[PDB]
């Protein structure tokens, strides 16, 4: 399984064929035990970011507000609404709010039954920072620019 970025233009998502902070919208926390998935909205102030992490469970993200850059393993991808991102199992990921004034808002869909996030260590960081674009974008407490 590889991660996919599906950019949208005029309600057509790239790579698809046309055939004829947190608000938990739907799922266990909101009173719905029936779906196999939980549906959340996240909002991040400009300059803000999610935690750089990996886990077995996948993500399906749709940007609905503002601008993002997503770290996907060895790639940094700019996003705007209504771009969709599939984050594959065990892919390192971090979403950054990159707009000037407009907060980033995105839908995030995950399995109802899912594992815990795992943080990168020194070797994880050193390996992933062999890419200059990734090194420049990622934020941990021991890693910022320079």
Question: Is residue 8 at the binding interface for K ion, with CB under 5 A as the rule?
Answer: yes
Residue 107 interacting partner from its own copies, K ion, none (CB closer than 5 to 8 Å by kind):
its own copies
Residue 38 has phi, psi (to 5 degrees) of -110, 140
Residue 130 interacting partner from K ion, its own copies, none (CB closer than 5 to 8 Å by kind):
none
**In the range 53-112, which residues lie near K ion by CB under 5 A?**
80, 83
**Residue 144, annotated ligand binder?**
no
Residue 44, token pair as written in the block: 């991040």
CA distance 72 to 63: 15
Spell out the long-range contacts of 99-103 with Cβ–Cβ below 8 A and sequence spacing 24 or more. 99/46, 99/66, 99/67, 100/46, 101/46, 102/46, 102/65, 102/66, 102/67, 103/43, 103/44, 103/45, 103/46, 103/65, 103/66
Shortest gap between Cβ of 39 and its own copies (angstroms)? 5
Q: Could you tell me the CA-to-CA distances from 107 to 7, 58, 119, 130, 146 in Å, in that order?
A: 15, 14, 23, 31, 32
**Residue 143, annotated ligand binder?**
no
For the window 59-98, what string marks contact with its own copies as x by the rule CB under 8 A? -x-x-xx----------------x-x-x-xx---------
**Active-site residue, 129 included:** no
**Residue 55, annotated ligand binder?**
yes
The answer to whether the CB of 109 falls within 8 A of the CB of 38 is yes
Q: Which of 61, 108, 125, 128 is catalytic?
A: 108
Annotated binding site for Zn(2+): 53, 55, 59, 93
Residues of the shown chain interacting with its own copies in the complex, contacts defined by CB under 8 A: 1, 4, 6, 11-13, 15-26, 30-37, 39, 41, 43, 58, 60, 62, 64-65, 82, 84, 86, 88-89, 103, 105, 107, 109, 111-113
């Amino acid at each position: 399984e590889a991660s996919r970025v599906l950019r949208e233009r005029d309600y057509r998502w790239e790579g698809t064929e046309e055939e004829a902070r947190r608000q938990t919208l739907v799922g266990r926390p909101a009173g719905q035990e029936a779906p196999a998935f939980e549906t959340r909205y996240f909002e991040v102030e400009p300059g803000g970011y999610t935690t750089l992490e990996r886990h077995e469970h996948t993500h399906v993200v749709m940007v609905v507000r503002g601008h993002a850059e997503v770290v996907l393993d060895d790639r940094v991808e700019p996003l705007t609404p209504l771009d969709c991102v599939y984050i594959a199992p065990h892919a390192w990921h971090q979403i950054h709010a990159t707009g000037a004034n407009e907060p980033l808002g995105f839908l995030c869909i995950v399995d109802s039954d899912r594992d815990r996030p795992q943080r990168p260590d020194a070797d994880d960081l050193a390996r992933m920072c062999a890419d200059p674009a990734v090194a420049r974008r990622i934020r941990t407490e021991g890693h910022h620019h320079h």
